[PDB]
């Protein structure tokens, strides 16, 4: 119909004249698509707002990572006769205690790994330990349904906390109050006054086993993640839940508080996510660890460690959410390949040594390579702007 | 206590029962079964027809019996992750 001819300039003036570098690679060239007919009163405004949202997202996923130095194995302590399920470090950073499946709580010397006394008195596997920083006590819990208070001045059990219909999987101590929280298979987290052994609060909101726990002084004070894949933020004053976080798809087995940033990270089989506390606002993913994440430990200098059920170990840069090191745990000689696993882990008080509890009857201690030199120990390479996250 | 039980009832619901050296094995079994169900529910990806827990538990029990009787227990169609998890839990039980 040759109403007009010669796309010769149009076919070039259209493609060329814009920002040369791709901004989000899907930028619709806002100025180019006004001139079509259609429904610009509503659809165009919605499309422009959406384009703004996606460009904001793609730009905000591009934080430059920091170096952070790699980690290496330094000690392999092999004394336990069962899977090591829990670990805690005393506030003075002199010794740490680990429970295991052989009913025993072994107290080790942090600097040397030399075994101090071994505590016995549990009927089944020990699943949680906590050394009180304000009392000379050591609380423990196990699949034998009872929570014990060991007096570390006499190495003897003094208190028993009784109400629990099934095994207990986690134990945490309130930083300020004289109260402790335990959560177990009865789908209930229970709040115990230390002195009177009374179950003041029964935080019953979940539908299945509460596999994780976290306690702090600010509200939310108790954070429980369970088999439901739901994380619940509790109001300890009233014993009622405030916010429920259902972003996870599978059971959330790891909860961890950032020491200095008032945020916490939770992990599950699919993804690791972290939130801002007062409202539980989602703040991003730590993608890359495709394994059953059992542990999460945040350092003081913004380093997060995620240990998996198959021995996979990934160190993350907290700020940028970048996995800067992949490590595979190697079993001690007598074990099977299926025996590679990690159940508990914890940074020591300084944050320079990482303690790992294995499905291997071994405790492994990891140390940053001391030479540093970002030129000689590069992290995993970082590639920006591949695509916006699906979300 | 006697008069309270006379004028009140059992109040049996909501009470716990400690493990008393006769329930140790039967409770250890419950805890192990629950743990294996958890691991099953985790390692299976999304939308893979989750209705498979009972058969895997039967496989685990058969593996334990074969270990007790010193028999290989080598199963043709079992996927590798399930087989590995069963071996892991069987080794735990055997060490106990």
């Amino acid at each position: 119909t040759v109403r007009a001819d010669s796309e010769n300039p149009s076919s070039q003036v259209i493609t060329k004249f814009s920002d040369p570098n791709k901004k989000i690679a899907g930028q619709v060239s806002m100025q180019s698509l006004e001139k079509i007919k259609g429904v610009p009163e509503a659809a165009h405004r919605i499309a422009g707002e959406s384009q703004a949202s996606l460009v904001k997202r793609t730009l905000a996923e591009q934080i430059r990572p920091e170096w952070h130095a790699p980690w290496t194995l330094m000690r392999v302590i092999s004394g336990h006769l069962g899977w090591v399920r829990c670990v805690d470090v005393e506030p003075g950073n002199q010794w740490f205690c680990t429970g295991a499946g052989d009913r025993t709580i072994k107290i080790w010397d942090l600097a040397s790994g030399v075994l101090k006394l071994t505590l016995t008195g549990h009927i089944a596997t020990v699943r949680g330990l906590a050394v009180s920083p304000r009392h000379p006590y050591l609380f423990s819990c196990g699949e034998d349904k009872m929570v014990k208070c060991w007096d570390l001045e006499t190495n003897k059990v003094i208190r028993h906390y009784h109400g629990h219909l099934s095994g207990v999987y986690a134990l945490k101590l309130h930083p300020t109050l004289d109260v402790l929280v335990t959560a177990g298979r009865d789908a209930v987290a229970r709040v115990w006054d230390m002195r009177t052994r009374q179950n003041v609060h029964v935080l019953s909101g979940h539908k299945s086993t509460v596999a994780s726990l976290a306690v702090q002084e600010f509200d939310p004070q108790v954070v429980t993640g369970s088999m439901d894949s739901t994380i619940r933020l509790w109001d300890l004053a009233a014993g009622k839940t405030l916010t429920t976080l259902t972003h996870h798809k599978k059971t959330v087995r790891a909860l961890s508080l950032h020491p200095d940033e008032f945020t916490f990270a939770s992990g599950s089989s699919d993804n690791i996510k972290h939130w801002k506390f007062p409202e539980g606002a989602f703040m991003g993913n730590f993608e890359g660890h495709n394994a059953i994440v059992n542990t999460l430990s945040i350092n003081s200098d913004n380093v997060m460690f995620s240990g998996a059920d198959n021995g996979s170990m990934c160190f993350w840069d907290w700020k940028s959410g970048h996995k800067y090191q992949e490590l595979q745990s190697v079993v001690q000689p007598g074990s099977l390949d299926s025996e590679a696993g990690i159940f508990a882990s914890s940074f020591d008080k300084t944050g320079l040594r990482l303690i790992t509890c294995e499905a291997d009857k071994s405790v492994k201690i990891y140390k940053q390579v001391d030479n540093a030199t970002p030129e000689t120990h590069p992290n995993l390479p970082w590639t920006p702007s591949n695509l916006r996250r699906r979300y | 206590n006697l008069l309270a039980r006379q004028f009140e009832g059992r109040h049996s619901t909501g009470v716990a029962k400690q493990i008393t050296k006769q329930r140790v094995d039967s409770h250890q079994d419950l805890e192990l079964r629950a743990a294996v169900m958890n691991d099953i529910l985790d390692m299976i990806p999304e939308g893979i027809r989750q209705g498979k827990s009972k058969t895997i538990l039967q496989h685990l029990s058969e593996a334990w019996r074969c270990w007790k009787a010193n028999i290989p227990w080598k199963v043709p169609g079992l996927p590798a992750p399930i087989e590995n998890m069963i071996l892991r839990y069987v080794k735990s039980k055997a060490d106990w």
Binding site: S269, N310, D337 | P81
Partner: peptide
Amino acid sequence: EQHKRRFEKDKSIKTWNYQP
């Protein structure tokens, strides 16, 4: 041979190593 016959973007889970 008889024994060997008788017996952005994201990814899926990986678990351990298998030995016959």
